[PDB]
Design a protein around this nucleic acid. Structure first.
Ligand SMILES: *[C][C]([O])[C]O[C][C][C][N]C(=O)C1=[C]C(C2=C3[C]=[C]C(=O)[C]C3=OC3=C2[C]=[C]C(=O)[C]3)=C(C([O])=O)[C]=[C]1
Ligand SMILES: *[C][C]([O])[C]O[C][C][C][N]C(=O)C1=[C]C(C2=C3[C]=[C]C(=O)[C]C3=OC3=C2[C]=[C]C(=O)[C]3)=C(C([O])=O)[C]=[C]1
Lengths: 454, 26, 428
RNA sequence: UCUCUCU
RNA sequence: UCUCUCUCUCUCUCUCUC
RNA sequence: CUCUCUCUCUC
């Protein structure tokens, strides 16, 4: 430390510059689509604007669309549902925008640079919302994985375009699903793993195996992944071995990064208020997102016979990526009880085309938490040598068995049997108050369900 | 359903899991 | 010898002039902060004064603060918690000072010269205190190194500003961690190692590899570190061998210099007593630090329900950089048993803002040792050969044969006192 | 320019 | 002008088998 | 290596 303060300050400015671009871009798009303050703060409108940007920068898909155009949709225009309130009633009109026009607007907002970090940030926000709202058991079964490992499905909807940043936030289960699909295509297609393309697939297979390996914590799990990577022609043996690895991650949890990626409407309102993210800096794991949401008011479309609080809790859960986190800890931080998914009387945030946009009313989202905590990239759960300082005739002791010791499957099973659902993790770490911006005094909680998707 | 947990916040809680069900399929 | 007597005497005077500058500057700042005799001898006050000077001379961070000012803090002013005792009770008030005014006071105390040696000496003292107090497994785990090699993290908190002198006192684990960060940055950023800045990074990578190579002793370790240096685009492979090299250092330990950097309060007291370090000379590895500490009285702020002896032991270990040394040898030198870190009923020396500065009392630190020893820059005595060497190594080979511990009255180190020797690991 | 909690 | 003993309580990353 | 180095930083 005392040298990593500078590095910490550097990172804060860089993330603040990304947040500024998103807000500056949203403000520009709002004034170009002619949206009022209420419609500018609608979460549905922000979703459409964000998706338009992501599609405009999808180089591969856009190229495919040009070569093989869809029916009635030219591959040069994007858009989505824009909801406007006229005479008190809500109406939806599909907006079509040139991808070149959107790309220029985004680049101009970020001082002429591509700034793919802002795009990946929005993609993470969509992934968090998808994780908190929709449960993809059909993909789990279709790949052969047990549908019970939904706690490891973090960032399963993230597109491959989100590298590094996206890969850090995605979980063990999603990573294993990517490996399995690669294995299945190799088994079905003999040409796979062979030829010029097979070389490219092999390097891709190696890279995602390494990042999956770094996600684990126990040495036994890492050694098991290392073996699977070495397989030149992976088959059922690696298929089953990876399935065991995913099952092991339920007890020996991996390191999944958790970041609070907010909707662009929040950033747009903050930037329009004169707030300078680049100057004071930002952080996706600190108090900055929590403080922003406290002062930020966001509206949403509420379908008939839907509890506005439950939708607000769903958006709150997506904002902080707490879909798979303990209900008790989430309830403590929010201050109001968090309900499991089965007891949420609401459908997804995004409104469908076939929906009668005449019985729909709008409500303010209560994205306010009583407490604030630090998001963790870690899962759950001495000196062995000496360095002489004085010129004395002693003997320099060392722990010979342990040092030389570091020179499969039964070991992993033994590790999880010792583990019990009572071990205290993150000892001494608690939840702070919104007025405590420096994380000085933690508030350790004392703790009926704890599974959101239970 | 869900039989495990993935912490997001740094708090002193205990990470629960459905031990009998996880070890049943072994 | 007989020609290095002059060289040794010359070096002693140069170090004494550095200590005189440190003492002279502390005296002026105490007189200029209006601190009484008791408050001046408080270790908390000395740290605050030391930290003010180090930040006043941080050109890079000061420049960044100017360009990108912080919130509520102007980048031209520095300071820290100053603890004043009036009416029996202690209170803390933040002092704000111009970094240029601090610089002028420091420069004037060194006869108008920058005297970067004094600043680095204070930096080593802070690192020694941090090493004995706090254990940084988070950085070890974050970089991918096993947290069990906490004995090689000597001087891990030292800023990069301490070159040469700083690198000599820092350990293999810190050097490896620095390289591993470079490798991690290079792997993540493809533009790393390329362009004009890549060339500057390459020279830094080479130079820091060279000092790591000189830190090692066995020919096998030097050759492997030589191989890691030759890599034009280091990656995961160079990641692994550096980790292996770090693990080998637990058995085939490197040569890490150990110097006794005392708090500035001790130097200020000595200079006020009339001691002329320039005339009498000084040495960071000899008896001079021990003889200074014997006659020096220093106070500290004690948190409620805290043993003063344990805090005094923590300061004693940080003073002589005995954080990673054998507890038996440390206990033998001090004369009172040194307790491991886990059994210390004390927190860090520095007091935080969120701490109620009203239930805090002060105690005298017992920084006196029954014996005194000479600090060492040495350890003790491809890849398959490296593993073979540490297999032959046993935790019973006697090192420093015939070299022992002397008496405070034996200023020439004539008659050694060899110890005969239940734990031995501070962080265990 | 699509839609979906939970084979 | 910060804080901390003992697994990440904050150290991003400048997007994809294009 | 029982003392024989240090004038600072990718500034
Ligand atoms: C394989 C091969 O083919 C690959 O190639 C690559 C290169 C080419 N490209 C070019 O030239 C261009 C591009 C573009 C784009 C972009 C850029 C960048 C980023 O980041 C993004 C993007 O996106 C997009 C594009 C195009 C189209 C679409 O659609 C999308 C450009 C612009 O933009 O302008 C130019 C050029
Ligand atoms: C690298 C680049 O980018 C830049 O460069 C620049 C160079 C010129 N200038 C300079 O350097 C200067 C500095 C100073 C200082 C100092 C000196 C010396 C020493 O040692 C220390 C120091 O510190 C400081 C400074 C400044 C500021 C601050 O803050 C600190 C000067 C003075 O001081 O005056 C001048 C110049």
């Amino acid at each position: 430390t005392d040298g990593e303060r500078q590095n910490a300050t550097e990172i804060r400015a860089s993330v603040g510059k990304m947040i500024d671009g998103i807000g500056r871009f949203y403000i520009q798009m709002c004034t170009e689509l002619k949206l009022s303050d209420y419609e500018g703060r609608l979460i549905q409108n922000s979703l459409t604007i964000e998706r338009m940007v992501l599609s405009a920068f999808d180089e591969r898909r856009n190229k495919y669309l040009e070569e093989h155009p869809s029916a009635g949709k030219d591959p040069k225009k994007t858009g989505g549902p824009i909801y406007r309130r006229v005479d008190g009633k809500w109406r939806r009109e599909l907006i079509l925008y040139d991808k070149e026009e959107i790309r220029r607007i985004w680049r101009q907002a970020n001082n002429g640079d591509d700034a793919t970090a802002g795009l990946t940030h929005m993609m993470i926000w969509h992934s968090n919302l998808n994780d908190a709202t929709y449960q993809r058991t059909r993909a789990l079964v279709r790949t052969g994985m047990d549908p019970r490992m939904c706690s490891l499905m973090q960032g399963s909807t993230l597109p491959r375009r989100s590298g590094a940043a996206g890969a850090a936030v995605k979980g063990v289960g999603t990573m294993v699903m990517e490996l399995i699909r690669m294995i299945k295509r190799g088994i079905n297609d003999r040409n796979f793993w062979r030829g010029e393309n097979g070389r490219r697939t092999r390097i891709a297979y190696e890279r995602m195996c390494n990042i999956l390996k770094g996600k684990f914590q126990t040495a036994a799990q890492r050694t098991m992944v290392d073996q699977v990577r070495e397989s030149r022609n992976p088959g059922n043996a690696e298929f089953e071995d990876l399935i065991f690895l995913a099952r092991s991650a339920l007890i020996l949890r991996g390191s999944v990064a958790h970041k609070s990626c907010l909707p662009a409407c929040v950033y747009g309102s903050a930037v329009a208020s004169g707030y300078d993210f680049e100057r004071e800096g930002y952080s996706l794991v600190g108090i900055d997102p929590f403080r922003l949401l406290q002062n930020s008011q966001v509206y949403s479309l509420i379908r008939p016979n839907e509890n506005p609080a439950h939708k607000s809790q769903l958006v709150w859960m997506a904002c902080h990526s707490a879909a798979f986190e303990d209900l008790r800890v989430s309830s403590f931080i929010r201050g109001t009880k968090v309900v499991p998914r089965g007891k949420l009387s609401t459908r997804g945030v995004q409104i469908a085309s076939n929906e009668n946009m005449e019985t729909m009313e709008s409500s303010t989202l209560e994205l306010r938490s009583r407490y604030w905590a630090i998001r963790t990239r870690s899962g759950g759960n001495g000196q062995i040598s000496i360095q002489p300082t004085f010129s004395v005739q002693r003997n320099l002791p060392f722990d010979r068995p342990t040092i030389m010791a570091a020179f499969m499957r039964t070991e992993i099973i033994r590790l999880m049997e010792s583990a019990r659902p009572e071990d205290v993790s993150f000892q001494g770490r608690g939840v702070f108050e919104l007025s405590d911006e420096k994380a000085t005094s933690p508030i350790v909680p004392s703790f009926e369900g704890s599974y959101f998707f239970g | 359903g869900q039989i495990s947990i993935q912490p997001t916040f740094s708090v002193q809680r205990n990470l629960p899991f459905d031990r009998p069900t996880i070890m049943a399929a072994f």
